[PDB]
Structures are given as structure tokens and as C-alpha cells.
């Protein structure tokens, strides 16, 4: 006792499965026991997206995150409407309405719900697509459908429309600069703990704003990157800016003793980043210390206390052997954290570049779905670290100070990094030239308050 659908001429999804339209991986879907689709025709992918035998949330999420490389949004909506509109070929008929038509129609409605809830940007960018969605939804008749139809309508309306903690965050730390005196704020005058906390907050929010739409299709590397990946780019620019600021703070401190204090304080900020699991922060420091202007300052490094050499070296070693220790450390910690994004970017790019868009079987072209799954696994990993916020109070002046940081000024990249390098050469010339002395620039004390909270709570 099978089922008997309509002819494939009158309904395209009735076509049987074969080696020419759908193929599977060996292994079965984790938690759920469903076959893992490797490749298929777009018709077959849509059949399975809305399959009658069972629900497939994994496939729905994966498909809706990645479909745009092989199917336009308008085409997808057309296809699921076609899927929904099932003709009939009363024993055979009652069974067919209840076990094929109704399940499939429900699944289409579920796709519509997920599409609108989690990928509303398709509709923000193409108003006609929303028009069609709305008049399709208004078309839907049955009492079985009413609940889902009303929920979809409710989401659409919400989408058309334009922080506090669990218990107490720690007390904000002040060193030399007093609260409100934004004019005094600098690397050494703010408290190193609070520098790390406020940068972690900035960098956390920056990490959390990046959406899959900015990543799938490697769009951040393409000519429209500023249009399609604005949040990712702002995030990376922040990181670059801080790295550059650290380099600048170092090489513009010409007095050796003062420069030692500067580098030492930066390593203290690193230590706190590490305590906060702000790996973006960790690497923005590591990048500064490995920069050509800083790395060569052997007289400065010599004077860094041994404890802090070890702290810096441990952090450097996270990057070694293709981020081997970073990767292991990230797996082992729980949120909140701020991952380093670069690894995800390279993995997504190479996944897309390194695998074919289609596979061929018996001369027929099948969409390579496993490639898209791999990309959705990476974007899923990104999203798992975006849910949990830090339990730290924002300080609006210190935050503003780091947002408005601009070490480059009006200079271009080449000009600026040449300036930093020439500055490094001046303060510590190449052997055999002797080391000059330089006057002190800081009129306040250089001693760090350290990296332990000042008060209880």
C-alpha cells in the first residue's frame, strides 16, 4: 500500500526519486534519523524541504540560510506555491488528503514562517516578494491552516516595524583619570581592567551584529562588500584600529622606560581579555606585538618582567600552527566570549571556492547541497557565541573614547605604517648604531594599579 500521487506532467514533485535527481551521504542526520541529502535538483530539494513523511528543521534552516547561490527568492516563493497547490488524482482520496496534501501544505506554511522570521531581509530588499507572500498567505483556506496563517501574518507585521543583568556586574575601575574627565583618558591613565572590559563590550556587540547574509556567498570579499557586509566590516575595522592604536602608543613613546611601561600595560589588558574570553582582543594585541615596528624592539622586550613575557608568549602561541591552540581553547570555554572572526571567514571562503556548485550524474545537473550544509555549519557555530551577553556595566565616556579612536588620522595605510616603522627605527636603531636617549613625555606615574579588582563584590 503506497499512495498514488498525480502525474508528473500535472504536478512536478510527483516524479520518483532516482540517481538522476537526488543523492544522499552515507551517514544519518544527528538526533533525528533522517537521510542527509548530498545533492539534488531544485525540485527535489523543495520536495524534501516540505516532505510529507516527516519534518526536517535542520534542512529548512540550512536551505533558507544558503539557497540564494542556486535559486532566486522570487523563484523559491513560486516553487513553494507550486508545491502547495496539489491537485487530486473514497478510500484513496481521504487518505491522500490527510497523509499527503495536509502534511505538505503544513510544511510549506512552516517554511514561510521560518523565511519571514529568520530571513526577513529577502523581503526588505524586494517589496514585490513580500507582496506575493502576503497575497499567497491570504489565499490559504483550511481550518487546519488558520493558526499558522495567523502566526505568519503576525510576524510579517512585527517585521515591518522599526539593558540590565542577572545579578550585579562588577564595579567600574578608575586609575588616574577621574570619572567624567574624558580629556585625560589615555592608555596609561584609564584603568587597564576597565579598558579591557569596555573594549570587550564594544567588540562583543560588534561580533553579535554580524548576520549570515553578510557571510554566505563570500560577499564580504566582493565588489559590493560595503553594501552587503557592513556590520562585519565595521567589526574588522574596529579590530584593525585597536591593533594600530597599540602599535602607535608603543612607538610614539620614545623614552625606553616609558615604552616599557606602555608595552607592560598592554600585556595587562591582554591578560584581562584572556580572563573575559575576548579572543578578538587577545589577537588585536598579539597582532600589534608581531607587527614589524614593535617586534624588532629588543631593548623594550628585554625589560618586560618575565611573568608578562610568558603571558604574551602563551597568547602568541594560540596563533601558531594555523590557530591549533586557539581552536582547542575556544571549544573548551563556555559563553560569553568574543571569537576571532577571521578563521570563520577563511573557512567559508575555501568551502565555497573549493567545492563544485553542482554535481553531475547520468548527464544531469544536481545542486551540490553538502557544500551549502558546510557553510551553514560555520554560520551556526558563529551564531552560538552571539546569544550570551557579558555581565559588565557600560561606561559611556570610556566607550565613546574607544569608538572615536583614530590612530591613522587623515593618513593612508602605506604612509601610516611607514611612519610607525620609521618611528621604530628612530627609537631603537639597527645594529651597530648606539641606542639614543629620549626625554619622558608622561607627567603622571607609570606604575600600574594591576589587574585584580580594587573593591569587594
Amino acid at each position: 500500500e503506497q499512495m498514488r500521487l498525480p502525474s508528473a506532467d500535472v504536478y512536478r514533485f510527483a516524479e520518483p526519486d532516482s540517481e538522476e535527481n537526488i543523492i544522499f551521504e552515507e551517514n544519518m542526520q544527528p538526533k533525528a534519523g533522517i537521510p542527509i541529502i548530498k545533492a539534488g535538483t531544485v525540485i527535489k530539494l523543495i520536495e524534501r524541504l516540505t516532505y510529507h513523511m516527516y519534518a526536517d528543521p535542520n534542512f529548512v534552516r540550512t536551505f533558507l540560510t544558503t539557497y540564494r547561490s542556486f535559486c532566486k527568492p522570487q523563484e523559491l516563493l513560486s516553487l513553494i506555491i507550486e508545491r502547495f497547490e496539489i491537485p487530486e488524482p473514497s478510500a484513496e482520496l481521504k487518505r491522500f488528503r490527510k497523509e499527503y496534501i495536509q502534511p505538505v501544505q503544513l510544511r510549506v506554511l512552516n517554511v514561510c514562517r521560518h523565511w519571514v522570521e529568520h530571513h526577513f531581509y529577502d523581503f526588505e530588499r524586494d517589496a514585490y516578494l513580500l507582496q506575493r507572500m502576503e497575497e499567497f498567505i491570504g489565499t490559504v483556506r483550511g481550518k487546519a491552516m488558520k493558526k499558522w496563517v495567523e502566526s505568519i501574518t503576525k510576524i510579517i507585521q512585527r517585521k515591518k516595524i522599526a539593558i540590565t543583568f542577572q545579578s550585579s556586574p562588577p564595579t567600574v575601575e578608575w586609575h588616574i583619570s577621574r570619572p567624567g574627565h574624558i580629556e585625560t583618558f589615555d592608555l596609561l591613565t584609564l584603568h587597564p581592567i576597565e579598558i579591557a572590559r569596555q573594549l570587550t563590550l564594544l567588540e562583543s556587540d560588534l561580533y553579535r551584529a554580524v548576520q549570515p547574509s553578510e557571510l554566505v556567498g563570500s560577499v564580504w570579499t566582493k565588489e559590493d562588500k560595503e553594501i552587503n557586509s557592513p556590520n562585519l566590516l565595521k567589526m574588522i575595522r574596529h579590530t584593525t584600529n585597536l591593533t594600530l592604536w597599540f602599535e602607535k602608543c608603543i612607538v610614539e613613546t620614545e623614552n625606553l622606560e616609558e615604552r616599557v611601561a606602555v608595552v607592560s600595560r598592554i600585556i595587562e589588558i591582554l591578560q584581562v581579555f584572556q580572563e573575559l574570553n575576548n579572543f578578538n582582543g587577545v589577537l588585536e594585541v598579539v597582532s600589534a606585538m608581531n607587527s614589524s615596528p614593535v617586534y624588532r624592539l629588543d631593548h623594550t622586550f628585554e625589560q618586560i618582567p618575565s611573568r608578562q613575557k610568558k603571558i604574551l608568549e602563551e597568547a602568541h602561541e594560540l596563533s601558531e600552527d594555523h590557530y591549533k591552540k586557539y581552536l582547542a581553547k575556544l571549544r573548551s570555554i563556555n559563553p560569553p566570549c568574543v571569537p576571532f572572526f577571521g578563521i570563520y571567514l577563511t573557512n567559508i571562503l575555501k568551502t565555497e571556492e573549493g567545492n563544485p556548485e553542482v554535481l553531475k550524474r547520468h548527464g544531469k545537473e544536481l545542486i551540490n547541497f553538502s557544500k551549502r550544509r558546510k557553510v551553514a555549519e560555520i554560520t551556526g557555530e558563529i551564531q552560538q557565541y552571539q546569544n550570551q551577553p557579558y555581565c559588565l556595566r557600560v561606561e559611556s565616556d570610556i566607550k565613546r573614547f574607544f569608538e572615536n579612536l583614530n590612530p591613522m588620522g587623515n593618513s593612508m595605510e602605506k604612509e601610516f605604517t611607514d611612519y610607525l616603522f620609521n618611528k621604530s627605527l628612530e627609537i631603537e636603531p639597527r645594529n651597530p648604531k648606539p641606542l639614543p636617549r629620549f626625554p619622558k613625555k608622561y607627567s603622571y606615574p607609570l606604575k600600574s594599579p594591576g589587574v585584580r579588582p580594587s573593591n569587594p563584590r
Binding site: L233, T240, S287, N290, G342, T346, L349, K350, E353, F421
Partner: protein, 169 residues
């Protein structure tokens, strides 16, 4: 077994990716998972000497401009890659070379120039222009085609030969 640490540099929109991917993957499996260790390490025999290549390709991270020094310092040898249909990526080569020399603190760093051909637009950098640039630097030029595997082994093996000639001296 000697291990050569190679670093690929060049502009985005160029197939730096495709070059390294096509080296590492077996010629007749178009498959690649960059999340595993074998994805960037390959054992090869070059001029009768078996050796291990470790290839750093940071494709996708070009916007992290302040991390370039860090990544470049990991290499003994460099492939400087441009796309033959992107003049800008060719004009940027001079800058990558200068940065490598500064990071390695050396005027003579093992290096090859690679012009990659993927898909359209059509060529804007004649191979003569690239041979002339390569020659002004004292380095080899290799032209490759991503899609056809042509030139790929030659580019990497030539760099290894450049490192061996550098290590003799």
C-alpha cells in the same frame, strides 16, 4: 623530512584560494574541507627530495590589514599572487613584496610571482608585463589556471627550489 612553510599573499577576488586548494586536493576529487589538518599540509617529492609543504593561505582575511606582518613572519617562502584580469592586484604586488622584505628583515627572501587565470573578465595583464616585473625583482614568474590545474605544481615547486637555493649560499 624537511618541512617548508609557505605563505600565499595577494589581493581578494583573485583565486589565492583556488591555487592552494588545487595543490592540496587530489587532481580528481573536487572536494575540500578546510577545517581539518590535511587541508593545508601535503607531502611531495621535488627534484628527488621528499618533503612536507605547509601552506598558509589567509584568503578572506584581507581586511584584517594589521595582521599581515604576523601572518607573513610565519613563512620561509612566499607566493605573491595576482589575477591576470585585475590590473590593481598586479600593481599591489610591489607593496606585498616590500612588506615581506621588511617583515623578514632581508633584501633576499624566497619568493615567486604568480599570475592566476580563473574566469572572465578577460586578461588585462600580459604575461610580458609580469615577466618584466619578476625580472626587476630577481624572482621567478609562473602563470596558472585554477580550473585546469595548469601551472599549479610549477608555482609551488619553483618556490621550494627558491628556498633550497637560498639555504645553500
Amino acid at each position: 623530512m624537511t618541512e617548508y612553510k609557505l605563505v600565499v599573499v595577494g589581493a581578494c577576488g583573485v583565486g589565492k584560494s583556488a591555487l592552494t586548494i588545487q595543490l592540496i586536493q587530489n587532481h580528481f576529487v573536487d572536494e575540500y574541507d578546510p577545517t581539518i589538518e590535511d587541508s593545508y599540509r601535503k607531502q611531495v617529492v621535488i627534484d628527488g627530495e621528499t618533503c612536507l609543504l605547509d601552506i598558509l593561505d589567509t584568503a578572506g582575511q584581507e581586511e584584517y590589514s594589521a595582521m599581515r606582518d604576523q601572518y607573513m613572519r610565519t613563512g620561509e617562502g612566499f607566493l605573491c599572487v595576482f589575477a591576470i584580469n585585475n590590473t590593481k592586484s598586479f600593481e599591489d604586488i610591489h607593496h606585498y613584496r616590500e612588506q615581506i622584505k621588511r617583515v623578514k628583515d632581508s633584501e633576499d627572501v624566497p619568493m615567486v610571482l604568480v599570475g592566476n587565470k580563473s574566469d572572465l573578465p578577460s586578461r588585462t595583464v600580459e604575461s610580458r608585463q609580469a615577466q618584466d616585473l619578476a625580472r626587476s625583482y630577481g624572482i621567478p614568474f609562473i602563470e596558472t589556471s585554477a580550473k585546469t590545474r595548469q601551472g599549479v605544481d610549477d608555482a609551488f615547486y619553483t618556490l621550494v627550489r627558491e628556498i633550497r637555493k637560498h639555504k645553500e649560499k
